Amino acid sequence: KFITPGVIDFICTSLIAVILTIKLFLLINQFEKQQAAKGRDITSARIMSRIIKITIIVVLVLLYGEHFGVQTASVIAVLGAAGLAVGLALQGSLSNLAAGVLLVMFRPFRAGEYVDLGGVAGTVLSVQIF
Amino acid sequence: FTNNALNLVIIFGSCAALILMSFWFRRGNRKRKGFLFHAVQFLIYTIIISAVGSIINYVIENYKLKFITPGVIDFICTSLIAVILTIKLFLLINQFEKQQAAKGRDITSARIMSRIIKITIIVVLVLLYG
Numbered sequence A: 001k002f003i004t005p006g007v008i009d010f011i012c013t014s015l016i017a018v019i020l021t022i023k024l025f026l027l028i029n030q031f032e033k034q035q036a037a038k039g040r041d042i043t044s045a046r047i048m049s050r051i052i053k054i055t056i057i058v059v060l061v062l063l064y065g066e067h068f069g070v071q072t073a074s075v076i077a078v079l080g081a082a083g084l085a086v087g088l089a090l091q092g093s094l095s096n097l098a099a100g101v102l103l104v105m106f107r108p109f110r111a112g113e114y115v116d117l118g119g120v121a122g123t124v125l126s127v128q129i130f
Numbered sequence B: 001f002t003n004n005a006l007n008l009v010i011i012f013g014s015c016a017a018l019i020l021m022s023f024w025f026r027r028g029n030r031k032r033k034g035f036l037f038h039a040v041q042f043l044i045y046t047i048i049i050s051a052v053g054s055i056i057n058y059v060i061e062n063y064k065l066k067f068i069t070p071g072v073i074d075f076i077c078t079s080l081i082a083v084i085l086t087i088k089l090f091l092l093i094n095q096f097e098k099q100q101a102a103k104g105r106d107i108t109s110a111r112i113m114s115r116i117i118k119i120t121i122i123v124v125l126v127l128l129y130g
């Protein structure tokens, strides 16, 4: 019917990607709710959620490049290098983010609990992203 | 021509996606970055340039080339996509510089950061232009 083979494959790949993204976003929402109503505030949870959403969007764009080389290849070649350079410079940022996520998950101390962290004692106000 | 059904469908889909995104944003502000409508425009422009390249190939294999070597359209579309990407990156740099300036920072540091980012983008352009 004058239909070039490949349209069905494109549709199925797009649908699979959409389902994967929806599941990832549901997981992000569950994680954000757990962080919020466990020990964390709202601003940090929202920031973490939107960071995860941006990361998923970036991974989608990177994987979507298998269709056209003039749509994402002309931009992915720079985005990947910039992200790698930032991660190399920002390694401490990711380390702090992971440590904060662990502190929210495992609760050695809660807000309003007098603690001593390496010679610096005082009441804990809130655990933020970094 | 009716033969380019795939190109017609892709262009119509890109246009419909842009229109729907505009309608959604009018009813409610888009989440994450405001750059969502800029990324949507970038992707639609990439799709349009791919369709234009396909139609040029069809014309060259069907219609007279008018002594035009195939590739000029591809070069033009790639250059236009790069220009749009650079404009969006520069707008993001300007937003970041304004935020740094009128948040806690002075003007000299903000200007230096902005021009450093501009130089980095120019370098990435030169590297990709090779």
Ligand SMILES: CCCCCCCCCCCC
Pocket: A047, A050, A051, A054, A083, A086
């Ligand atoms: C409201 C806070 C917005 C921050 C969203 C995440 C930004 C990630 C930038 C990554 C640069 C390497």
Ligand SMILES: CCCCCCCCCCCC
Pocket: A031, A052, A101
């Ligand atoms: C209940 C167990 C949850 C464990 C999931 C951890 C997810 C870490 C998110 C990392 C964000 C960059």
Ligand SMILES: CCCCCCCCCCCC
Pocket: A105, A106
């Ligand atoms: C009190 C709930 C504890 C949940 C901890 C789950 C273990 C996460 C392992 C992460 C490995 C990177």
Ligand SMILES: CCCCCCCCCCCC
Pocket: B112, B115, B116, B119
């Ligand atoms: C007025 C300050 C000009 C500095 C502009 C950035 C220079 C970057 C040089 C990078 C060398 C590796």
Ligand SMILES: CCCCCCCCCCCC
Pocket: B096, B117
């Ligand atoms: C509101 C969130 C803004 C986050 C963007 C960070 C950009 C870092 C610039 C790095 C310059 C080399």
